[PDB]
Amino acid sequence: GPLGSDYIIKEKTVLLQKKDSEGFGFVLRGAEFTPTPAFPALQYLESVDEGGVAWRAGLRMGDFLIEVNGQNVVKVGHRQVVNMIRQGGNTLMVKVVMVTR
Ligand SMILES: *C(=O)CCC(=O)N/N=C/c1ccc(C(=O)O)cc1
């Protein structure tokens, strides 16, 4: 609008179940910190394997990670989030947000 940006924020919470011999099918990457609509979390999905577990559940490149297995990760560093995901083994429940104009 004439007074500032307009955009849509879409929240997605998904349950990922994978087999032992595969990954969840995404690459996590990290971008004193206050979340903003243009920068809602420290970790985001740099890529998502088309047809992989995460893709089939509805996760997409560019999604920002808000929660992992009931723990908020908005302000959590990359290595700690990786450990939280691995702690769940073949199960990952994650909330993400995707921002678009
Ligand atoms: C995890 O594998 C996601 C991809 C990723 O994190 N790649 N990291 C690249 C990188 C790390 C450090 C430096 C540097 O010190 O200049 C450059 C690039």
Query: How many CB atoms within 10 Å of residue 82?
Result: 14
DSSP-derived pairing of the beta strands 43-48 and 71-72: unpaired
Resolution of this entry, Å: 1.6
Give the count of alpha carbons within 13 A of 91, CB side only: 5
Query: How many CB atoms within 10 Å of residue 79?
Result: 9
Structure obtained using: X-ray
29 Cα–ligand 1 center, Å: 8
Using the atom order of ligand 1, give the atom closest to the CA of residue 27. Answer: 3
Are 99 and 37 in contact, with CB atoms under 8 Å apart? yes
Can you list the domains of the chain with their CATH numbers? 12-97 (2.30.42.10)
**Ligand 1 pocket mutation pick from 46, 61, 65, 86 by most atoms within 8 angstroms of CB:** 46
Contacts of 5 (CB under 8 A, 6+ apart): 101
For residue 80, give the DSSP letter: H
Closest by Cα among 47, 51, 52, 38 to 9 = 38
